[PDB]
Design a binder for this molecule. Structure first.
Ligand SMILES: Nc1ncnc2c1ncn2[C@@H]1O[C@H](COP(=O)(O)OP(=O)(O)NP(=O)(O)O)[C@@H](O)[C@H]1O
Ligand SMILES: [Mg+2]
Length: 276
């Protein structure tokens, strides 16, 4: 056996640019075979892939993704390691969640919103059981496969915990408004701080891709949160769901539900919504 991720460039047809990553343009394209063929893919490119250091940082997402196999985590298809260096993944054809929600607003009901939240909770309980911390949970990093299916991507910041306590910190303009207080205060990242971010993500989804604490300053937000202030209940969010969100935003990370618990409660809230 042994899964070989090295793909041949002849099997790839490069299509149009569909976005931008930190290392370069992302394209859609086609991955081909003589048999079991025509597969639409996303292709991340890398501007400066001649530098060992840039190349190493870029291919690390791919290294992290070869560990995962989940219906709601973006799948790694392979890599081309010869220059120009490419990362090949399954295409999420409907794109970014924020854009999708803002536009498909009048074609989606409440049950679809809770479903997306539920699907993400299964991907995160999966990571939680593998002792993997994401660190960048936000609707901006959720992608849409189809109308009834979202997937977590962006594994650039994702780290494997030896289960031992925290992660450290390197560099980057921190998404303060999504961050748990102990991540802002101690640069501490755990499954519990992922849960905090997921609560903010759920809020976003329920607000149809509106951003948390808009018009508020990154330094005023920290103080608001300490003083006990929380993001308001979204319009037509069920009281049971908002209660769930508020538990995710417990200042003490030990008081926050685990993902395995959130998964079960969302499943129950989803049935009640579809039922009533
Ligand atoms: N599998 C995919 N399918 C469709 N679009 C994708 C896919 N992967 C990436 N993209 C697009 O590329 C954009 C950036 O992807 P992402 O993984 O968040 O890159 P990044 O370098 O980590 N950017 P950042 O969010 O700042 O950390 C996404 O918002 C999508 O528009
Ligand atoms: Mg990233």
């Amino acid at each position: 056996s042994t899964r070989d991720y090295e793909i041949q460039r002849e099997r790839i047809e490069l299509g149009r640019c569909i976005g931008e990553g930190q290392f370069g343009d992302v394209h859609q394209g086609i991955y081909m075979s003589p048999e079991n063929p025509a597969m639409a893919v996303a292709i991340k490119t890398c501007k400066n892939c001649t530098s060992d250091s840039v190349r190493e940082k870029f291919l690390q997402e791919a290294l992290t993704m070869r560990q995962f196999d989940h219906p709601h985590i973006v799948k790694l298809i392979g890599v081309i390691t010869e220059n120009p260096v490419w990362i090949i993944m399954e295409l999420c054809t409907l794109g970014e969640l924020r854009s999708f929600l803002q536009v498909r607003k009048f074609s989606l009901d409440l049950a679809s919103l809770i479903l997306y939240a539920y699907q993400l909770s299964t991907a995160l309980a999966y990571l939680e059981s593998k002792r993997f911390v994401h660190r960048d949970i936000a609707a901006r990093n959720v992608l849409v496969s189809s109308n009834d299916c979202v997937k977590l991507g962006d594994f650039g910041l994702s780290r494997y915990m030896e289960d031992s306590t925290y992660y450290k910190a390197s560099k980057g303009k921190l998404p303060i408004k999504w961050m748990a207080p102990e991540s802002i205060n101690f640069r501490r990242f755990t499954s519990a701080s992922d849960v905090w971010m997921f609560g903010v993500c759920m809020w976003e989804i329920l607000m149809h891709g509106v951003k948390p604490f808009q018009g508020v300053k990154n330094n005023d937000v920290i103080g608001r949160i300490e003083n006990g202030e929380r993001l308001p209940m979204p319009p037509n969010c069920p009281p049971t769901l908002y209660s769930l969100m508020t538990k995710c935003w417990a200042y003490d990370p030990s008081r926050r539900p685990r993902f395995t618990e959130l998964k079960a409660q969302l499943s129950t809230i989803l049935e009640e919504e579809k039922l009533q």
